Each structure stands twice: as structure tokens, then as C-alpha cells.
Swiss-Prot record, chain A:
SUPFAM superfamilies: Translation proteins SH3-like domain (SSF50104). Component of the large ribosomal subunit (LSU). Mature yeast ribosomes consist of a small (40S) and a large (60S) subunit. The 40S small subunit contains 1 molecule of ribosomal RNA (18S rRNA) and at least 33 different proteins. The large 60S subunit contains 3 rRNA molecules (25S, 5.8S and 5S rRNA) and at least 46 different proteins. Belongs to the eukaryotic ribosomal protein eL14 family. Signal peptide: none annotated. GO terms for biological process: cytoplasmic translation; ribosomal large subunit biogenesis. GO terms for cellular component: cytosol; cytosolic large ribosomal subunit; nucleus; preribosome. It is found in: Cytoplasm; Nucleus. InterPro entries: KOW (IPR005824), Rib_uL2_dom2 (IPR014722), Ribosomal_eL14 (IPR039660), Ribosomal_eL14_dom (IPR002784), Translation_prot_SH3-like_sf (IPR008991). Keywords: Cytoplasm, Nucleus, Ribonucleoprotein, Ribosomal protein. This is Large ribosomal subunit protein eL14. It comes from Schizosaccharomyces pombe (strain 972 / ATCC 24843). One of its GO terms (molecular function) is RNA binding.
From Swiss-Prot, chain E:
Belongs to the eukaryotic ribosomal protein eL33 family. Component of the large ribosomal subunit (LSU). Mature yeast ribosomes consist of a small (40S) and a large (60S) subunit. The 40S small subunit contains 1 molecule of ribosomal RNA (18S rRNA) and at least 33 different proteins. The large 60S subunit contains 3 rRNA molecules (25S, 5.8S and 5S rRNA) and at least 46 different proteins. This is Large ribosomal subunit protein eL33B. There are 2 genes for eL33 in S.pombe. Keywords: Cytoplasm, Phosphoprotein, Ribonucleoprotein, Ribosomal protein. Pfam families: Ribosomal_L35Ae. The keyword Ribosomal protein applies. It is found in: Cytoplasm. Component of the ribosome, a large ribonucleoprotein complex responsible for the synthesis of proteins in the cell. The small ribosomal subunit (SSU) binds messenger RNAs (mRNAs) and translates the encoded message by selecting cognate aminoacyl-transfer RNA (tRNA) molecules. The large subunit (LSU) contains the ribosomal catalytic site termed the peptidyl transferase center (PTC), which catalyzes the formation of peptide bonds, thereby polymerizing the amino acids delivered by tRNAs into a polypeptide chain.
Swiss-Prot record, chain F:
Keywords: Cytoplasm, Phosphoprotein, Ribonucleoprotein, Ribosomal protein. One of its GO terms (cellular component) is cytosol. Belongs to the universal ribosomal protein uL13 family. SUPFAM superfamilies: Ribosomal protein L13 (SSF52161). It comes from Schizosaccharomyces pombe (strain 972 / ATCC 24843) (Fission yeast). Component of the large ribosomal subunit (LSU). Mature yeast ribosomes consist of a small (40S) and a large (60S) subunit. The 40S small subunit contains 1 molecule of ribosomal RNA (18S rRNA) and at least 33 different proteins. The large 60S subunit contains 3 rRNA molecules (25S, 5.8S and 5S rRNA) and at least 46 different proteins. This is Large ribosomal subunit protein uL13B. GO terms for biological process: cytoplasmic translation; negative regulation of translation. There are 3 genes for uL13 in S.pombe.
Curated annotation (Swiss-Prot), chain H:
There are 2 genes for uL6 in S.pombe. InterPro entries: Ribosomal_uL6-like, Ribosomal_uL6-like_a/b-dom_sf, Ribosomal_uL6_a/b-dom, Ribosomal_uL6_CS2. Pfam families: Ribosomal_L6. This is Large ribosomal subunit protein uL6A. Gene3D superfamilies: Ribosomal protein L6, alpha-beta domain. One of its GO terms (molecular function) is structural constituent of ribosome. It is found in: Cytoplasm; Nucleus. Component of the large ribosomal subunit (LSU). Mature yeast ribosomes consist of a small (40S) and a large (60S) subunit. The 40S small subunit contains 1 molecule of ribosomal RNA (18S rRNA) and at least 33 different proteins. The large 60S subunit contains 3 rRNA molecules (25S, 5.8S and 5S rRNA) and at least 46 different proteins. uL6 lines the binding pocket for eukaryotic elongation factor 2 (eEF2). Component of the ribosome, a large ribonucleoprotein complex responsible for the synthesis of proteins in the cell. The small ribosomal subunit (SSU) binds messenger RNAs (mRNAs) and translates the encoded message by selecting cognate aminoacyl-transfer RNA (tRNA) molecules. The large subunit (LSU) contains the ribosomal catalytic site termed the peptidyl transferase center (PTC), which catalyzes the formation of peptide bonds, thereby polymerizing the amino acids delivered by tRNAs into a polypeptide chain. The keyword Ribonucleoprotein applies. It comes from Schizosaccharomyces pombe (strain 972 / ATCC 24843).
Length: 125, 120, 167, 23, 106, 196, 122, 183
RNA sequence: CUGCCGAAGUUUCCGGAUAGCAGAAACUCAGAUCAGUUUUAUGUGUAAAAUGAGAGUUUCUAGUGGGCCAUUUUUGGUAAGCAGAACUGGCGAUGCGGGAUGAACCGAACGUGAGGUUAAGGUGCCGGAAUGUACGCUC
RNA sequence: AUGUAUAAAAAUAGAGGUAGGCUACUCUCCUGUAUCGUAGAAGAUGGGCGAUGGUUGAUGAAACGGAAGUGUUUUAUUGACUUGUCCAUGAAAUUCCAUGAAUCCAUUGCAUACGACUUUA
């Protein structure tokens, strides 16, 4: 296995008002619940159910039950931010978000982009 | 009544007895045939020596009624290929001989005399 | 969702008892009306204090003082069965006394097919030391090296590809 | 059924079961 | 070739009914891409039409159309209720409907 | 969410009841459904329990002319079609039309082995059945009740896998070429800010 | 339908809109505001073209009291082409300065497979 | 319980791979393959140790951990040492005639209790049959698969069954005498 | 042919007279009396605040005088059923939603329609409605 | 019908690779909200610039597809179009939604209540 529910694991919230955010399991409650926190101010420290999160492969050292400030301090020290973005999974998710917020004019420019990209279709014989 | 495995007791839908099962194929055995067609003529009675070990008429003779079937040699006029499918055997294609005798050409026509003899 | 309520009441003052004792209970109910009703039923069944001759002097909702800290609660209960006489003690690990009560009601109704009326809460305490923690699963949750794979991972019908259903 | 016997019961049979439960 | 279809596709599922009574006046329409009653709030008030063909060449045309209006969502799965000028025939259960993008508010 | 003219469903690893209920709704919706690999369907419960189920189903027969009783069909496609049919108003013209808009086949015939085969997430065994629980397969169940084409379908599917895998290798090699030429053009990275 | 058009001004009820006639051949027309999808494409200058001339009476049809008659040769009056040509002359520099707008306005919008209007942002 | 694990240390056996739950153990004696797809147990391979792990399993599934551990240990013993079963012929009046064919893979038994029937029993794959010279009327069953060897011994004993006679007096038959390793 | 009003479904005395329920005619009554109701007080009964409603009588003239089902109390019980009362209900004069189907079960009581919202019961498919959410039990 | 556009396989307490020598690497998964395709009087008329490709129509083919192969390729041409990047004309008053055999008649008896069936002509 590559993913384990353990203290110090970074998780991605999937269901709820915090969908798409990154959190870290500060403490573990039981087989069905977990307590998480995030350095971003918009994400409060809260208890979540395991169905709402997906375990990311990134695990960072974290003492059990650390307060929000020290969690942010450890987060900045170990540079979890942009370490998640280094993964191809994050790039796909961010690209999906950018595609979602595109308007009609941007989509037209995309068509011209890929039409010019398709123009070459040149390969060695 | 009789056995329930033979009902519904109705007329056979064919004058010629159709084979419903052939012996299982074997690659070890070389290529041969399995069935033949003949015409019943009648039977007689014959006297035959009984070489039946353990029987009470061993090394003796008995009288047996035996049916005589005339079997003139059969002419191979074609071949049919069968392909196994998830819905059973299926006739993939049929190849006939170039020249067919009038005996087998008469089969395709109800009135061979009035026909234009256009088969094949 | 349940809400913890502090309920204080007494009988109506009278020349016999000009200063009746104020009885206070900590009981859980969805709303105030249910909490007062359960209080009066308990007071009648314990101190034989009539609902008619009494009145309610104070009602206050109680919030969890430390709702962000994982805790283990031990709950004493007097469950009613076919014989209508039982008493058990159960331990639940969670972050709110309300949550432990919520878990206990769901558990008892799931196993013994109990109801809110068949259940009466006897005492709720917060067991803080691993020494007093008794249940095996609670102990295996307070182990320092707790880690395990996530179980039960699980419109847009007609998915084109097979699910990963793994990591 | 599937076992040997129909789980579904006759309407007069259900009522007399209710009557037998009452007494 | 794909420079047309300014409309969203939909299917006429059934009438608005109880277990035993049908009300043919209002029809349940499954607009595709819609997945919730919150999503159906976008398609409220749009113009849904039923395009079919007949033998006669009325106005020199083989194709006739029954217009209609999306009224309100129906259920949690994103279906909608539509009121057509002429109530749709019972033979159109499962047929295709066209939900135009007008009257637009986007 | 969407529809096509014809939907091909790869019934491997699906559950008989869950898939049939989804299929029956799609047929009443007006879509044409083709369920391939019907012999690879799964049913909850262990093999012996399901075999006794069908056997007991075989017991359903009249005294008068058993040819007038319930016709028991042994093929896995016919088993699946019976499950779908009981979920349809088959005594009405609307129900009869929906049935005719469905084609259940064992394995994958040639007209459908060169088309994309979608799967139903709501009917998949790996998502619906708790791990370690006993489940049977309609192919083994059918072949024990009297279906007599298990081996040939297994052989024909082996050939289909071999031919299809060779096609995938050709397409993957082509995909490798187009992928290499994808980022070769600088225009891809010029304004990829739109997420493409 | 499906033509991308530039809005000149808002009338009492309709929008007096016209695409650059040399681009997509859309003359000055009243269009009801419920039959228009307002895209978030970058704005262009409209303050430089006179629009007070376009009135409800100006767009109004004559009385009723033939198809070879009328037609946009005989019944399309000369001055109408003069405002139309003037509008294109006043609008072309803006769409020339900002990239892809001439190409964008020439193209026609249409939905494709898997396109959901309730999610797509215009 | 959350965690239930059994640890096994591997001997000098070459390969103990459990890819796709298919244990394919290659040792000095040979290579044995078995399928453990009927048990939902994690098979962690790290260095010289193999962990059979079950998370949140019931007692019925938890009992499979030790059973899996033993059978894997048994087959590992087979690829390293092998299994050998010694059976002694027992006859009162009629000597039991035993002949070996295809280097012993099939045993046909005659002259049992005076019966003229030739009982032919084929051993399971991975087993060979030999006649011991040190001890008379001795049959040796050696191979890699303990289950196959034991099943072959059980089949031989079951075939040579005395019927309709008093067991207390009639003792004719073939029975297992010694079970162990090759060395 | 349409419209309006609309029961009794049984006491009490010898087939009935009576009463009761339904109407009509003619009277007086609004600072008045009533009530399938609840409080208060005196010792379950009696008497006087709450709430609702306009409240009374006299004449005379139709129809009704059965039963069924169920609850509770109680009398015995009895292999076990049940049997005897009382009690007010439900049906009976009455369609409708649900209970797969139904004299007695859960809702609901009816002019013709449009829209909205619910009851009882439901939301895998037949079948309108979440193959919803959360926690357990079961092979 | 309105793009009627999309063919690996298996596992799910795991797979697929890439890069290696059945074993040592690291990467990817976590659904398609993807990919292909999509500017043009239902798509007009010319002119450049830059590819030297793409889309096809009609021929001529050869290789492949049997499970229901009724379709996959490779192509040799020929006829078109090309938006790959720029230009110049045209649309409109539709001046605010509507879209050769068989049968009968005969013949046979291998058949038969009557039809049917087997023959012959």
C-alpha cells in the first residue's frame, strides 16, 4: 500500500464546501473520522469523515495534535505547498480548474491554438 | 400406454432417416467416412456357428433371421463445411462437383420431366 | 441533531416548603421542549416530584468546552429489554459529548433494536487516561503508531473506463 | 417462497394471527 | 458540419402521474447534462419543442413541431416539468425533445 | 448525463440485478442497448445457492403439456434478458418496444468488438459487494444447468483478446508518435495558460 | 442564429445590434434581449459611432394597404447603406487593434457533443 | 481488530513471489505454483520476511491468515526439503501385488484378498512412487506438494478398502506408516 | 331531468301507541338563554367562570324500531377456543389517496376547472419520487 | 439523425508502463469536466504568404477480417477542398420568436378418415 491514514498525511477534500482544498491529518479520531487543519486561513481546523477526503501520497513529519500555527510552521518548513503542485495529479486538477473558468472567447482562442498545433502532424518516415 | 420418451407420437417429417448424431472426431485416426445409405430388400434365415465363450451353445450352430439391404456404391457430389459458433454448428459454405448425374439432379425438382434441367 | 441541555427546576413554593431544593440535570434532547419533558419524566421517576406541582426555573444549552480535542467518553445506561431491566457501560472516542451520545443511540438502536424511550442516560464522564480506558478497540485507537489503509473507499452513468478503486 | 412455503399469507389468516396476538 | 444545434437535447420520459393516475397536461422531461434540481433552475422558462414528421406537405413541409415551455424541476435527479401547447401523445414516451436556449438570461 | 444511438455495455464484473435495472430504465428512456459478455456477469451469493435457485426455477412446469409451461432458457444472455424483462411493462406495447431495443449476446461478436464498450459504475461488483463475500458467475451457473457452449466461447474470446491486443499495440505506437510530436511544436507551450 | 454580433445600444425593449457587415453580414437590427447570450469577450468602442439616429420609428415597417420586388437592392435605400458603412468604418479600428476579434466574430457559435450550457460560462 | 498479522521468515529458497496472489515458490528442489485468490489477505514482501496482513477482518476471515501461513510454509518446505510418505503393505493370506508404471506415477494393485480386480490408481502431479529395498512390501511416496502426496496416500488406502467383512478380524489393507521430509 | 332539505337505524309502555331523530305552520324571544366541552367551589354528584353559538317553546306529519365489526371494563373462564353483559366508536346513507388485490387497516370525507402544498404511504426497475447522507447488525 | 466522432486486457488487499537485467528502476492512476474534431451566403468569390500536410469523391488494386467475418488497413492514380498564416470582395427589406418453378388434373403405395406424404409423368 502507498496510502495510510496516519498523523502527518496531506489529504485532498472532495465532498463538502471545502472541495479541492489541501488538508493534513493533525489527529485521528477513529476508523470513520479524522481531525484536519490547513495553513490557508480560509480552511478552519475541523473534524472530517474519511469519505470526504482522498489520501494523497505526500506525507510530512508532524507531531500528534499540533496546533494550527505550528502546523502552518511545519507546512512552511517542509514546503508542502508547491510540493503537491510538483505532482502530475495537481497539474491536471489545476488545468481542469482553468478550463472550467474559461469563457466563450477563450475557448475560441483554444480552438485556434489546437488547430495550429494540429497543423504540423509531421513525423519522420 | 408406452414409453413417454417417444411422444408426441406423430408422423415422421422425412421419408429418409436423418442422422441426428455422428461419432466424435479424432485427429489421431486418419480420414474416413462414418455413414452409408441403403435400401431394404427383405430378410432371410441363416445357419451360423456359435463361437460364444461361456454360452450354453458354444461351438454349435443356431438359426438367425437376417435383413438384407442393397447398398450400391454411393457417389460423392459435394462437400459442406461446418464452423462451430456460440449458437451451434453453422454451414459456412458448400462446394459441389462439376458434373452431377441425373439421379442427384432429379432431387432438386418435383417435376424433373417438365423442368428445363437448369440445375447447376 | 441532539443538543446538551442543563435543566433546573423545582416544585411550586408553598407554606410547607417555602424554599424547595433546585434540582439540576444534564440531559440530551433535540430541543428545549423535549429536554423539559424528559426532565419532568425523570424527576417524577426519581424524586416523585409531580410535573403538575412543579415549574422550570432555568434551561441552558451546553456547548462542548473543547470541541477540537479528541476525547474518550464512558457512558452508563439503563436499557429496557423484554424484561425491561438492564444496565451497561460503553466507551466512545470522538470530539464532542453530543457526538458520543449520538453514537451511543445509533449503536444501541442498531444492535438491541432500542428506542429513545427505552434508553435512559444514567451518567456521562470523560475518561482521559489510557489506564482507565478498558475497551480493546479504544486502546487500539490510542496506540501511538496508529495507521491503517482506508476501508470502504467506494449522475453520469456509463463510465467509459474501469474504476481504479485503489490508490 | 423458494424454501418450501409461501411467505405471503392469506388475508383472513393475517387477521386471525392479529387476533391470536391480541389474546 | 457541426456548426449548428443551438439547442440542448432532452427526452420525454412520461406524464406527471401518481401510481395509478396520469395527468397528460404536464410532462416530465429529462434534459441531458442536467443532474440536480439546482441545475434545472437554469433551464426553467426555456422553450422545449417536439419535432416530428407527417405524410402531408402542409405549407410545403414534411415536418411539424409542437412547442412547449419548461415549468419547474421534478425530483432530485434534474428532470423538469414541461407544458406544451398541445399535450404530447403517449407514443412520444422516450422520444427526443429540443430545449432551445431562449428566452435566455445569460 | 448523455446518450448515444447505441450503447455497448461490457457486462464483465457487473451484477445481474444492478445492471438489469439500469438497462431497463435506459430502454424505457428510448435508447438502444447492447450488453456483451453476458456470460461474465456476477450474482450475489455463493455458487451452490444460486444453482439451487435456478434448479427450483426448473421445477416450475405444468402437468399438461410442459411445452405450455415456463420455457427455461439456459444461455447467460437469455438469463440476463429474463431479468431485464421482468423490470419492464412487457404486457403493453411500450414494454414490448423496449425489449426489442435490447440485444444481449454471449462474448463479443465481430460487429461489437470494434466499438467502445462502456461500463456501469452502479452495477460493478468491486464497488457494490463487500470484499470477501461470496458471488457466483452466470457463465459457470449456465454451463452447469445445461448451457453447452462454454468452451467455444472461451476459445473465441481468447482469439478476440489476441487480435484486440495487437490492435492496441498498433494504436499505442501511433499514440506514442503523436504524443512525441505534441510538445515538439512550441505553440503548445506558447499559450497553454488556458489549461490545454 | 449562432452569429456573433456587436451591441451598439439598448433601445426601449430591444438591442440595436450589428456585426461588422464586412465580417459576418449582420446589418443593424433590433433583437429582443431575451434572445441574446451576452458573452464576456473584451469590450470594444461604441462611443465613437452615432446611435441616436436609430429609433423605433426608423426600424418600423411600412403599411400593408412581390418577392422580386422589395429585396435588398430596390427596398434597401442608399442612406441605410451609408449608416451601415459608417458603422463598420467606426468599429473596424477597434477590432483590428485587439487580436482575434475579427476572426472571433466571423466564426459562428454552436453547441457540440458534451457541451452543457448550465456549466459553460459565456 | 484493526491489525492482525503473521510473519514468516524465508529460507534460502530462490523466489517466493506472490504476484497477483499467485505464490510461485522456486527452490533448490523445484518450482511450485499455487493460487491464493480465495483469501483476501495482504501479502507484503520485504527482504527476508513476508507479512500476511488483514485489516478490519471478521473472525471467519481472520482464521484464513494462519491457514494461508501454514500452506505457504508447507510448500516452502517442499521446494527446500520435499515430502516423503512411507506406507507398509498389510496382508493376511494373499500377498498384495504392486507394480509401478511411468516411473511410478500410476500404481496398479492386484491379488488383494483374492480379488481378481486390478485396481489402478494414478498419483497427483509432483509425486513419484517407488518400492523400498531396505524394507520389504514398502511403498514410498515422495514429491514436492505435501497435499498431493498425502492425497495420493489417502486415495491408495481408500481404494484398498475391505467391505462387508469384520474389521476386527480382517486386517488386510494399505496404511500410512511414516510421514516426513526427504532428509 | 335537474336542484334543495335529510334521517332513524331504539328507548319507554301494552302489532301498535309514545318518546327520539327530520321538516312545516303559527307564536316570543337578543340587559336571553343554551351546550355530547373545560375550569372553580361545596360536600363521584351538586352549585357558579372560560369558550362557542341568537336562543326558546306550542301545534302536525312523514320515514325509522335492525344488525355487523372493534376498543375498554368485567363475569366465568377452557385441554385450547370462547361464552355473558356494559361502553362509545366504525360501517351502515359514502365516493377518493395509500395498504400488490380486498365490507371492515392507515389518511381523507365529494359542485365544474387552473395553479400551489401536503396527509397516509413511498423514491433500484415495473412506478410518479435520492442506486441520497451518516452509523451499526446480518451470509 | 443534427459531430448519430472514440474497439487493449486484467487486477481492485492493484495494475500499467518507461528505463533496465523471471529480479533490481523510477514514473503514471485517484474515471471522459478526457481525446479526436470544430472559424467560412449548411458554409459564397478571388488574391497572397507558409507548408508539402490533412480531409475526402471516383477508379485500379492487393493484404486482412467467419462469432453474426458486411468491415479493417496498405495503397497506385484521378477529381476536389484546405482555416496553417495573412488579405480583399459578397450576404442584407427574412428590417424582434416560429421549421425459371410450384400446384391442380393424372400416376404410384414406401402413405392414407379427408388433406397430407413417397413416387412417375
Amino acid at each position: 500500500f502507498k496510502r495510510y491514514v496516519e498523523v502527518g498525511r496531506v489529504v485532498l477534500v472532495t465532498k463538502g464546501e471545502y472541495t479541492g482544498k489541501l488538508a493534513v491529518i493533525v489527529d485521528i479520531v477513529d476508523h470513520k473520522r479524522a481531525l484536519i487543519d490547513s495553513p490557508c486561513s480560509e480552511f478552519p481546523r475541523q473534524v472530517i469523515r474519511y469519505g470526504s477526503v482522498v489520501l494523497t501520497h505526500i506525507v510530512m513529519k508532524l507531531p500528534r495534535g499540533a496546533r494550527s500555527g505550528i502546523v502552518a510552521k511545519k507546512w512552511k518548513a517542509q514546503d508542502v505547498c508547491n510540493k503537491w503542485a510538483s505532482s502530475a495529479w495537481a497539474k491536471k486538477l489545476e488545468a481542469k480548474k482553468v478550463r472550467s473558468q474559461l469563457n466563450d472567447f477563450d475557448r475560441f482562442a483554444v480552438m485556434r491554438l489546437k488547430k495550429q498545433r494540429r497543423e504540423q502532424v509531421n513525423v519522420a518516415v | 400406454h408406452g414409453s413417454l420418451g417417444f411422444l408426441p407420437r406423430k408422423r415422421a417429417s422425412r421419408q429418409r432417416g436423418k442422422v441426428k448424431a455422428f461419432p466424435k472426431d479424432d485427429a489421431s485416426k486418419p480420414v474416413h467416412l462414418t455413414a452409408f445409405l441403403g435400401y431394404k430388400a427383405g430378410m432371410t434365415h441363416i445357419v451360423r456357428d456359435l463361437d460364444r465363450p461361456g454360452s450354453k451353445m458354444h461351438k454349435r450352430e443356431i438359426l438367425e433371421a437376417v435383413t438384407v439391404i442393397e447398398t450400391p456404391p454411393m457417389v460423392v457430389v459435394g462437400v459442406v463445411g461446418y464452423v462451430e459458433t456460440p449458437r451451434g454448428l453453422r454451414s459456412l459454405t458448400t462446394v459441389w462437383a462439376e458434373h452431377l448425374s441425373e439421379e442427384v439432379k432429379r432431387r432438386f425438382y418435383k417435376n424433373w420431366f417438365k423442368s428445363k434441367k437448369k440445375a447447376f | 441533531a441532539l443538543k446538551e441541555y442543563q435543566v433546573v427546576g423545582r416544585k411550586v413554593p408553598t407554606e410547607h416548603e417555602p424554599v424547595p431544593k433546585l434540582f439540576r440535570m444534564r440531559l440530551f434532547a433535540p430541543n428545549e421542549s423535549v429536554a423539559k419533558s424528559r426532565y419532568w419524566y425523570f424527576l417524577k421517576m426519581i424524586n416523585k416530584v409531580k410535573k403538575a406541582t412543579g415549574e422550570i426555573v432555568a434551561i441552558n444549552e451546553i456547548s462542548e468546552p473543547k470541541p477540537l480535542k479528541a476525547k474518550v467518553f464512558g457512558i452508563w445506561i439503563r436499557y429496557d429489554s423484554r424484561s425491561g431491566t438492564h444496565n451497561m457501560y460503553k466507551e466512545f472516542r470522538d470530539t464532542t459529548r453530543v457526538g458520543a451520545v449520538e453514537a451511543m443511540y445509533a449503536d444501541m438502536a442498531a444492535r438491541h433494536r432500542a428506542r429513545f424511550r427505552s434508553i435512559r442516560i444514567l451518567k456521562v464522564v470523560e475518561v482521559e487516561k489510557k489506564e482507565d480506558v478498558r475497551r480493546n478497540y479504544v486502546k487500539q485507537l490510542l496506540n501511538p503508531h496508529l495507521k491503517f489503509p482506508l476501508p470502504h473507499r467506494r449522475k453520469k452513468v456509463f463510465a467509459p473506463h474501469r474504476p481504479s478503486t485503489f490508490y | 417462497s423458494l424454501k418450501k412455503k409461501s411467505k405471503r399469507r392469506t388475508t383472513r389468516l393475517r387477521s386471525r394471527i392479529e387476533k391470536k396476538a391480541a389474546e | 458540419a457541426q456548426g449548428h444545434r443551438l439547442y440542448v437535447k432532452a427526452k420525454h420520459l412520461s406524464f406527471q402521474r401518481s401510481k395509478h393516475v396520469i395527468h397528460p397536461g404536464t410532462s416530465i422531461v429529462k434534459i441531458e447534462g442536467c443532474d440536480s434540481k439546482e441545475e434545472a433552475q437554469f433551464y426553467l422558462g426555456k422553450r422545449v419543442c417536439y419535432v416530428y414528421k407527417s405524410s402531408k406537405a402542409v405549407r410545403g413541409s414534411k415536418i411539424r413541431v409542437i412547442w412547449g415551455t419548461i415549468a419547474r424541476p421534478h425530483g432530485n435527479s434534474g428532470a423538469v416539468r414541461a407544458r406544451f401547447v398541445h399535450n404530447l401523445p403517449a407514443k412520444t414516451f422516450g422520444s427526443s425533445l429540443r430545449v432551445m436556449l431562449y428566452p435566455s438570461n445569460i | 448525463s448523455e446518450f448515444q444511438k447505441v450503447v455497448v455495455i461490457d457486462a464483465k464484473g457487473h451484477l445481474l440485478g444492478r445492471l438489469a435495472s439500469v438497462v431497463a430504465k435506459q430502454l424505457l428512456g428510448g435508447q438502444k442497448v447492447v450488453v456483451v459478455r453476458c456470460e461474465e456477469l456476477n450474482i450475489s451469493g455463493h455458487f451452490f445457492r444460486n444453482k439451487l435457485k435456478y434448479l427450483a426455477y426448473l421445477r416450475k412446469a405444468c402437468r399438461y403439456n410442459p411445452s405450455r409451461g415456463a420455457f427455461h432458457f439456459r444461455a447467460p444472455s437469455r438469463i440476463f434478458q429474463k431479468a431485464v424483462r421482468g423490470m419492464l411493462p412487457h404486457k403493453t406495447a411500450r414494454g414490448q418496444a423496449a425489449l426489442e431495443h435490447l440485444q444481449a449476446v454471449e462474448g463479443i461478436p465481430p460487429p461489437f468488438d470494434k466499438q467502445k464498450r462502456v461500463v456501469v459504475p452502479a452495477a460493478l461488483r468491486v464497488l457494490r459487494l463487500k470484499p470477501g463475500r461470496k458471488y457466483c458467475t452466470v457463465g459457470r451457473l449456465s454451463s452447469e444447468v445445461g448451457w453447452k457452449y462454454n468452451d467455444i466461447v472461451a476459445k473465441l474470446e481468447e482469439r478476440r483478446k489476441v487480435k484486440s491486443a495487437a490492435f492496441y499495440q498498433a494504436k499505442l505506437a501511433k499514440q506514442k508518435k503523436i504524443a512525441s510530436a505534441k510538445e515538439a511544436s512550441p505553440v503548445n507551450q506558447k499559450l497553454s495558460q488556458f489549461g490545454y | 442564429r449562432g452569429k456573433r454580433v456587436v451591441v451598439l445600444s439598448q433601445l426601449e425593449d430591444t438591442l440595436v445590434v450589428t456585426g461588422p457587415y464586412k465580417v459576418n453580414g449582420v446589418p443593424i437590427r433590433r433583437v429582443n434581449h431575451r434572445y441574446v447570450i451576452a458573452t464576456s469577450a473584451p469590450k470594444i468602442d461604441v462611443s465613437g459611432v452615432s446611435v441616436e439616429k436609430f429609433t423605433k420609428a426608423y426600424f418600423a415597417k411600412q403599411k400593408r394597404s412581390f418577392f422580386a420586388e422589395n429585396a435588398p437592392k430596390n427596398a434597401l435605400p442608399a442612406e441605410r447603406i451609408a449608416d451601415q458603412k459608417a458603422v463598420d468604418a467606426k468599429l473596424l479600428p477597434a477590432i483590428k487593434a485587439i487580436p482575434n476579434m475579427k476572426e472571433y466574430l466571423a466564426a459562428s457559435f454552436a453547441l457540440s457533443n458534451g457541451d452543457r450550457p448550465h456549466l459553460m460560462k459565456f | 481488530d484493526i491489525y492482525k498479522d503473521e510473519t514468516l521468515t524465508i529460507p534460502k529458497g530462490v523466489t517466493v513471489d506472490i504476484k497477483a496472489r499467485n505464490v510461485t515458490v522456486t527452490g533448490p528442489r523445484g518450482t511450485l505454483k499455487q493460487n491464493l485468490r480465495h483469501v483476501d489477505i495482504e501479502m507484503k514482501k520485504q527482504g527476508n520476511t513476508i507479512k500476511f496482513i488483514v485489516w478490519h477482518g471478521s473472525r471467519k476471515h481472520n482464521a484464513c491468515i494462519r491457514s494461508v501461513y501454514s500452506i505457504i510454509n508447507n510448500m516452502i518446505i517442499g521446494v527446500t526439503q520435499g515430502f516423503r510418505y512411507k506406507m507398509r503393505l498389510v496382508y493376511a493370506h494373499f500377498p498384495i501385488n504392486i507394480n509401478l508404471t511411468e516411473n511410478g506415477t500410476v500404481v496398479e494393485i492386484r491379488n488383494f484378498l483374492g480379488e481378481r480386480i486390478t485396481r489402478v490408481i494414478k498419483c497427483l502431479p509432483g509425486v513419484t512412487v517407488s518400492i523400498s529395498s531396505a524394507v520389504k512390501d514398502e511403498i514410498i511416496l515422495e514429491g514436492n506438494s505435501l497435499e498431493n502426496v498425502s492425497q495420493s496416500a489417502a486415495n491408495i488406502k481408500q481404494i484398498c478398502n475391505v467391505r462387508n467383512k469384520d474389521i476386527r478380524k480382517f486386517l488386510d489393507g494399505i496404511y500410512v506408516s511414516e510421514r516426513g521430509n526427504i532428509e
